[PDB]
Amino acid sequence: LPESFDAREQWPNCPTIKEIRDQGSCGSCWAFGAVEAISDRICIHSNVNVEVSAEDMLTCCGGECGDGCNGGFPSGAWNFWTKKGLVSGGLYNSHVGCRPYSIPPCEHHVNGSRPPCTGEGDTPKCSKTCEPGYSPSYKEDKHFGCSSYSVANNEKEIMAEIYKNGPVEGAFSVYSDFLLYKSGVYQHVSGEIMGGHAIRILGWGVENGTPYWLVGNSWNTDWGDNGFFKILRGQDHCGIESEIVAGMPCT
Numbered sequence: 001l002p003e004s005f006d007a008r009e010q011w012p013n014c015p016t017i018k019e020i021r022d023q024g025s026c027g028s029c030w031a032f033g034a035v036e037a038i039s040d041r042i043c044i045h046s047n048v049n050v051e052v053s054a055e056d057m058l059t060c061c062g063g064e065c066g067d068g069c070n071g072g073f074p075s076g077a078w079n080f081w082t083k084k085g086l087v088s089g090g091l092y093n094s095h096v097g098c099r100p101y102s103i104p105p106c107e108h109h110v111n112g113s114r115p116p117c118t119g120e121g122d123t124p125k126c127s128k129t130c131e132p133g134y135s136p137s138y139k140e141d142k143h144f145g146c147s148s149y150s151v152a153n154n155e156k157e158i159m160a161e162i163y164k165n166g167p168v169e170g171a172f173s174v175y176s177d178f179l180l181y182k183s184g185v186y187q188h189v190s191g192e193i194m195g196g197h198a199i200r201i202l203g204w205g206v207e208n209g210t211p212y213w214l215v216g217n218s219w220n221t222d223w224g225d226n227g228f229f230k231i232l233r234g235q236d237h238c239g240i241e242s243e244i245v246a247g248m249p250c251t
């Protein structure tokens with residue numbers, strides 16, 4: 001395997017790989033990390049661009065995925081994709097796809113022109129219809145996954161999975177010092193635990209002798225390094241390697 005790897009560079013025809021979303025004031029990271037990677041993989045394994053709806057995942061999976069804006073299970077999300085499939089849907093107010101995200105973007109632990117995130121948000125309703133003007137119908141717009149699996153807590157296997165099939169979803173323990181991340185390779189040295197956080201891992205590299213994972217957060221682009229961040233790789237730091245999940249799109 002190469003010393004470095006950036007899925008954004010390796011798959012130039014898949015722009016979703018370089019985009020950063022905003023989960024808004026909702027604990028829907030579990031759903032965002034999933035639909036983002038799923039969007040990436042649909043493009044990688046059927047070369048077609050599709051913004052997989054975070055709204056559909058967040059609102060219709062139900063208990064199988066946890067508790068909506070209160071948190072969920074990443075592996076459950078990929079299961080839903082293979083069971084019920086997912087329709088398309090873009091950013092809030094974008095009017096793109098069957099079900100665009102309905103929760104407003106906000107400032108995540110940074111100042112900006114948007115309203116500060118309030119963290120407290122209810123899970124929107126599971127509506128099985130598309131936005132007015134869009135076609136086809138909700139049922140006709142479903143994209144199915146044909147496999148949902150968990151990648152072992154093994155650095156090399158996680159790299160091989162990414163290298164071959166594209167970005168995966170992972171999770172780690174977020175501590176207060178991570179909220180102020182700007183650049184470099186993140187390493188937890190202090191701060192109270194804020195909770196678990198699911199994200200999208202799209203690569204890896206080495207910075208000043210420090211190995212890292214290339215990750216895309218869902219707190220908009222004005223957070224961290226244009227929305228992305230780097231985190232220590234190889235020592236299951238904060239559990240970054242303890243919960244990798246992925247899957248393959250049908251055909």
Ligand SMILES: *[C@]1(C(=O)N[C@H](C(=O)N2CCC[C@H]2C(=O)O)[C@@H](C)CC)O[C@@H]1C(=O)NCc1ccccc1
Nearest residue numbers: 026027028029030071072108119171194195196197
């Ligand atoms: C994932 C999540 O969304 N995390 C939360 C979060 O990032 N925010 C809440 C308000 C907007 C945003 C922000 O902080 O700017 C918080 C708790 C992290 C600091 O609680 C969500 C989840 O799915 N957790 C369960 C879980 C299950 C398995 C592995 C990891 C996490």
